Each structure stands twice: as structure tokens, then as C-alpha cells.
Amino acid sequence: VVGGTEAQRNSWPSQISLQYRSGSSWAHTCGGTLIRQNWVMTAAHCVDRELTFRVVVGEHNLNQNNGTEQYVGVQKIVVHPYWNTDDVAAGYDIALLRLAQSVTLNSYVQLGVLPRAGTILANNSPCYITGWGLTRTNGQLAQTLQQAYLPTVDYAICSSSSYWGSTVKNSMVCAGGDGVRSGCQGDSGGPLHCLVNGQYAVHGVTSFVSRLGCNVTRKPTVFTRVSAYISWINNVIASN
């Protein structure tokens, strides 16, 4: 997250760190959202790589023991059937990971609330992006969770020519684009938390940023619209 501030520890308890084994160590590669005690929601581009992955829940500082972490392996990865690695602009950047064990819920570990199917937010809706991704374009990962206030940019504006044009589809959410704050690499797959009826719900899964850089004016961070996938999500969890 570019232009963020440090999140307090129990602020966003459904946020997970998706990591892969690198030699003898594990590196954070993407964010995710805990949606069931044994199911995490993330972007399908984060699991394109056949690597060994684990999920870290109740995490705050990646380089230090917080005393709250739970470490779990990934037992099954279910990527959206239409996801195409060579076309992220086509959408379908969503994946579900079945965890090897059920995690324990406590104040640091909670389930993310999903929106009702087909819900579309009004332009300029108050949302926050959270993650340990790069803090500057071509910079380094954050050590502690960062958060940035990133209001939505509706479809008509986001798909206009000054913004993203045709790259953005109606199955996506745009947020930010002020040239100061944004999602960045390493934030992918993580949540876009939006306040709806007094509750924060996860309306987006971080998908992409501009090729030109993370924080670029008129190039909001683009998210997979979670409300477009509620039936798919439920059909996967019910049969696996």
C-alpha cells in the first residue's frame, strides 16, 4: 500500500498473508480474506505459480512474533474456471483456498463479511485497502499492516477514456486514483473493505494497478467485484 498509515492490530481480522516456501524460508506474496474457518478468498493470479503455499492468520508484523499468528497449509486451490493468466483485464481474478485445518476465531482472527450478490456501491463510497505490499512503486514490502482510505470510482467514470477505458469491466471495482494512495504489488488478492449499513464488508479482491506505477492519478487500483461472485463462492464451498 502506497500512501498508507499503519493499521492497529485488531483492526482488520479477516486479512491474511499468503506466503510461499522460498528455499528454507517463506515469503509473503499476496493478501487474502478469511471467509470460513477453513476457506480463504484471494486473487487467481496469486496462485498461478505451482508453489508451496501457506496462510498466516492474525498477523501484524511480518518479521516479528506478534504472539497472535496461526500458520496453516493450503490443501486445495479452486481458481475461477474462466480465469485466464494472459488476460487479467478479462476479469475472473478470484480463487478460493481450502485450508488444511480450521483456524481458531478470536479477536485477531475473524471471518470477513461478504456483500449481497449484485451490490454495486455509489461513486465515492468510503472504503479502505489493507495489505503488506510495496509502499512505493518499485519499493519494498511493508513490515506491518498498512491501510489507505480509498473511495470508490464508479464504473462509468472508471471505464471512461481518461481513466482505464475498456480494460476495466463491470465485474470489477475501481478505488482511489488520486496519485497519492493506492494498492501496490504484494497487496494483490487482499481486501477492499467498504462501510455499508454500519458494517465493513469485503467488496473487492485487489487485482491490478497500472503498468506505469502503483499510485498514478486517474489510474485507480482495480479490484475483482466480490458481489459478482457470490453464487460461485457458495457453490464451491458447498461442494468441497
Q: Which residues does the annotation mark as catalytic? A: 45, 93, 188
Q: Which stretch binds Ca ion (CB under 5 A): 58-66, 74-82, 102-110, 202-210?
A: 58-66
CB neighbour list of residue 50: distance below 8 Å, 6 or more residues apart: none
Residue 66 touches Ca ion, criterion: CB under 5 A: yes
Residue 61 touches Ca ion, criterion: CB under 5 A: yes
| Chain centre distance of CA 28 | 13
Angstrom distance (rounded) from CA 236 to CA 188: 21
Based on the number of CB atoms within 10 Å of its own CB, is 231 exposed (0-12), middle (13-18) or buried (19 or more)? Answer: exposed
Region for 63 from its dihedrals, namely left if φ exceeds 0, alpha if ψ lies in -120 to 50, beta otherwise: alpha
Identify the three-state secondary structure at position 236. helix
Q: Which stretch binds Ca ion (CB under 5 A): 14-22, 60-68, 112-120, 141-149?
A: 60-68
Q: Which is nearer to Ca ion, 9 or 218 (CB)?
A: 9
Among the listed residues 153, 99, 145, the one whose alpha carbon sits nearest the alpha carbon of residue 125 = 153
Q: Does 6 belong to an annotated binding site?
A: no
Min dist CB 9 to Ca ion, Å, is 10
Q: Does 64 belong to an annotated binding site?
A: yes
C-alpha cell at 49: 505459480
Build a one-symbol-per-residue string for 6-45: x at contacts with Ca ion by CB under 5 A, - elsewhere: ----------------------------------------
C-alpha cell at 177: 486514483
C-alpha cell at 46: 496469486
Q: Which is nearer to Ca ion, 11 or 119 (CB)?
A: 11
Name the residue whose CB lies closest to Ca ion: 66
User: Residue positions in the annotated binding site?
Assistant: 59, 61, 64, 69
Q: Which residues bind Ca ion (CB under 5 A)?
A: 61, 66
User: Residue positions in the annotated binding site for Ca(2+)?
Assistant: 59, 61, 64, 69
